[PDB]
Amino acid sequence: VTVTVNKNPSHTVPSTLYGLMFEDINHSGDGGLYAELLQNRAFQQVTPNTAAALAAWHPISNAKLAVIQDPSPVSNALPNSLQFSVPSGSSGRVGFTNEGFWGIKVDSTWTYKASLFFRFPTSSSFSGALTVGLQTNAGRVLAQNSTQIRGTTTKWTQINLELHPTASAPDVSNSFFVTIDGAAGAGQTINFAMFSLFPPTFKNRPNGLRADIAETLAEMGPSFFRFPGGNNLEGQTTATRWQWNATVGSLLDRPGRVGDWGYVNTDGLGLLEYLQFFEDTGMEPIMAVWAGYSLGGTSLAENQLAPYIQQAIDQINFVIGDPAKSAPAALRASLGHPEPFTLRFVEVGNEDFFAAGSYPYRWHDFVTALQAQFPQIRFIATTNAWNPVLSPVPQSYDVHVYQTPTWFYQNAFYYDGFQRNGTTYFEGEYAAISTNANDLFGTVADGRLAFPTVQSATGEAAFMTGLERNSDIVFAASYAPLLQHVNSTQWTPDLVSYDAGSVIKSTSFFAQKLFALNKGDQYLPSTLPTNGGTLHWSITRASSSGKTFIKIANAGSSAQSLTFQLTQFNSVSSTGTLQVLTGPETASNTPEAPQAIVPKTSTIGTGKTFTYNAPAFSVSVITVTTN
Ligand SMILES: *[C@@H]1O[C@H](CO)[C@@H](O[C@@H]2O[C@H](CO)[C@@H](O[C@@H]3O[C@H](CO)[C@@H](O)[C@H](O)[C@@H]3O)[C@H](O)[C@H]2NC(C)=O)[C@H](O)[C@H]1NC(C)=O
């Protein structure tokens, strides 16, 4: 096919076109992006005196463990304590371990920060060292530090100890430990609460993020971060919804919540930590507010909304408000960030098409209130576009689609026929998730993708060329889900996967990265691809530099030739760069082969005419300079 490139741009490409979608799913927050290494660190939202309250915790030697409703808890938010009892007659090493989130990476190049709170409920004569550390799951100690404690300490006391491993572990099958001398401790009980173990964090942020994952997200050049959901915003019930205020301040005062994917969220990754990450990466937020619906099917009545609308206002004021004018903004200032953060986009609920009966009044009441307080924010509706009819008329809709790879290339013209009437569209969740059109949300045996494939990424890339062509009305687009702990998965496929020690960048991740990093501010119209065809392209140009990015998706099984005609330009560089992602149709990056499919960069001859053969199942970016 001959592709003629117009020199005259048709529209400005939004700064926001490519970004990320985040919720805590697949242990993407706790166990993932949030750097805390101990699972069930503070016994949040568990039932005292149950086995499940002890999840991730194990005795050393003859230690007796129970999670109790402490008569004197460390805080109101953390009513549960670990009761650690040493039997009479004990000796040697007695204590307990935490297995982490399916392991803990122990790296001698890292300093770890351990902490805990303790008290003796019964004043005792105990006088001896409390040791914390890291051990292999065979009990081989790799790091340790200690401090003196006294049985007379009957009020909560924090211990803070650094840990320096003597050797890196050969795998992630390691645990955190706490021990005392069994003879010194014989017959005694200690209550513990609010444990933590951190590695070095991204940008050395206090209470920050896991470095390899954070860097991987930054590597993709995202422009926005949609958060905190997604389903995990909604709760199963009003009472279990995400609440911003429960996520800010001291970790002692964060109660955690049962999230929407089968596990407790600590809310250690809370609103301020999200905002700091955006500062650290240059992303801007697309922040959701809870909108009166939860996943059990309950809509709050219209005459019930006011306190929830106020909570949304409070949430936004925490982000952007003048500290002198609201308590949430004063709180932001008091936590060390008096300056407002950026916030241009707020999403009202999540997937309210499932609650489209009540969304008209919820949308109306939330948006009229929020727009009145925040006249510069653009509010995004979550129902299906234009059905039901909302008031006020939405400026934006969030469109989600989970489909087959084929659907994505067949639907690259999704936005071409939309009216240009002042509405913008956020493709806030999309992914090619299955090869089985008859059972998209099924099992792997029934065609569900365990990991993105070259087929899925190239189908998505074809669709993305349509997002970029239609970026006069498409302002933002994010794959979902973003992150997956391979040891605790509720949804596949996911953009980036990991275990306790390493990261897997998917085929889809590379398609995302190639689109986001090679994106000009000008859209250059070109010969249209065949609507329904497997071969797609989109061309943009950087106004300041003339860097011109030709993005090509071949989502099909046939190689396809493209001849590019740039004769309208005064000049075209004599060479360009080629970045190509390709491989067998069903190839994936997996924990066992994490670099099976990676992009390749080379230099090609260019000018006013050049020919490229786009391989079967490929994403290609050709970069030339044009003036
Ligand atoms: C985060 O902020 C919200 C908003 O203040 C807090 O939620 C509020 O919590 C109070 C205390 O639970 C709720 O009050 C109770 O209301 C019911 C029935 O209307 C009544 O039976 C009780 O005696 C009591 O008055 C209040 O309704 C609730 N508001 C909302 C919007 O949920 C929340 O507790 C804060 N979270 C943290 C961790 O600080």
Ligand SMILES: *[C@@H]1O[C@H](CO)[C@@H](O[C@@H]2O[C@H](CO)[C@@H](O)[C@H](O)[C@H]2NC(C)=O)[C@H](O)[C@H]1NC(C)=O
């Ligand atoms: C045990 O932990 C303590 C407390 O973290 C470590 O002492 C700290 O060391 C850092 C680095 O020198 C200092 O910045 C802090 O001021 C120290 N605090 C205290 C209270 O001493 C100590 O180095 C650790 N020891 C081992 C063997 O890991």
Ligand SMILES: *[C@@H]1O[C@H](CO)[C@@H](O[C@@H]2O[C@H](CO)[C@@H](O)[C@H](O)[C@H]2NC(C)=O)[C@H](O)[C@H]1NC(C)=O
């Ligand atoms: C932008 O264009 C779309 C497409 O015509 C409009 O969508 C229609 O909206 C009405 C209600 O307002 C519905 O009854 C139609 O089904 C919608 N059409 C389609 C194809 O979805 C939308 O109203 C326009 N918006 C503005 C702001 O002018």
Ligand SMILES: *[C@@H]1O[C@H](CO)[C@@H](O[C@@H]2O[C@H](CO)[C@@H](O)[C@H](O)[C@H]2NC(C)=O)[C@H](O)[C@H]1NC(C)=O
């Ligand atoms: C976490 O997941 C990883 C990856 O799936 C598991 O490691 C794999 O385990 C299977 C079955 O034992 C092996 O055949 C693979 O060779 C392993 N892959 C790699 C890359 O090591 C790991 O065992 C899981 N961890 C836990 C605690 O369940």
Ligand SMILES: OC[C@@H]1O[C@@H](O)[C@H](O)[C@H]1O
């Ligand atoms: O990305 C996974 C889920 O898909 C959509 O149903 C939900 O918003 C999201 O939580």
Ligand SMILES: [Cl-]
């Ligand atoms: Cl398919």
